[PDB]
DNA sequence: ATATGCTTACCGTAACTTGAAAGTATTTCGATTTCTTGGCTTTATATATCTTGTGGAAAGGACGGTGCTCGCTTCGGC
């Protein structure tokens, strides 16, 4: 993903809405190397996490209400700290980076 | 006018992945070993009889420096 003349380091999504989302109907969540052969300027390593953090549905999002602190408590009560410990390996999509 | 809001380029280790070099068992080709028969070596008087191979004969062909002065011949003299 470095020293490559064919990659693009942009911030927005120019044509990504069509180049990257078609794979949702084309390929599964495996063998991402088939995607980079058709989408120029994008590498599979960043594309995986982009697809993940963009097309996920089950996330703790919204405004901080009077019922979310209990959610945080029961989240940090499942196995422990969760952010950086090994217990993050079994947390479903609850990665530490978020 | 600026800090945390989420978003994503990318430099933190890790394992199940594609296929060429290196160690491993296995049957097959070929070389080795071990059986078999059968003569080698002693003897026995027998003795057959017919050929082989020899041998001392007969008898042959086969190859086994330099004067020096008597005397020998040939013409050759008148």
Swiss-Prot record:
Compartments in which it is found: Nucleus
Subunit structure as annotated in this protein's UniProt entry: Part of the SNAPc complex composed of 5 subunits: SNAPC1, SNAPC2, SNAPC3, SNAPC4 and SNAPC5. SNAPC4 interacts with SNAPC1, SNAPC2, SNAPC5, BRF2 and TBP.
Full-sequence range covered: 393 to 490 of 1469
Superkingdom, taxonomy of origin: Eukaryota
Cited function: Part of the SNAPc complex required for the transcription of both RNA polymerase II and III small-nuclear RNA genes. Binds to the proximal sequence element (PSE), a non-TATA-box basal promoter element common to these 2 types of genes. Recruits TBP and BRF2 to the U6 snRNA TATA box.
Entry's disease: Neurodevelopmental disorder with motor regression, progressive spastic paraplegia, and oromotor dysfunction: An autosomal recessive disorder characterized by delayed motor development and developmental regression after the first year of life, followed by progressive spasticity with gait alterations, paraparesis, and oromotor dysfunction. Most individuals have cerebral, cerebellar, or basal ganglia volume loss.
Domain HTH myb-type, chain residue ranges per copy: 4-59, 60-98
Protein name, UniProt field: snRNA-activating protein complex subunit 4
Portion annotated as DNA-binding: 32-55, 84-98
UniProt lineage: Eukaryota, Metazoa, Chordata, Craniata, Vertebrata
């Amino acid at each position: 993903k470095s020293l490559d003349p064919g990659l693009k380091k942009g911030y927005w999504a120019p044509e990504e809405d069509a180049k990257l989302l078609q794979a949702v109907a084309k390929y599964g969540e495996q063998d991402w190397f088939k995607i980079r052969e058709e989408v120029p300027g994008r590498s599979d390593a960043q594309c995986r996490d982009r697809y993940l953090r963009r097309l996920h549905f089950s996330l703790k999002k919204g405004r901080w209400n009077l019922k979310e602190e209990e959610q945080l408590i029961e989240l940090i009560e499942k196995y422990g700290v969760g952010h950086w410990a090994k217990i993050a390996s079994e947390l479903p999509h609850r990665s530490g980076s978020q």
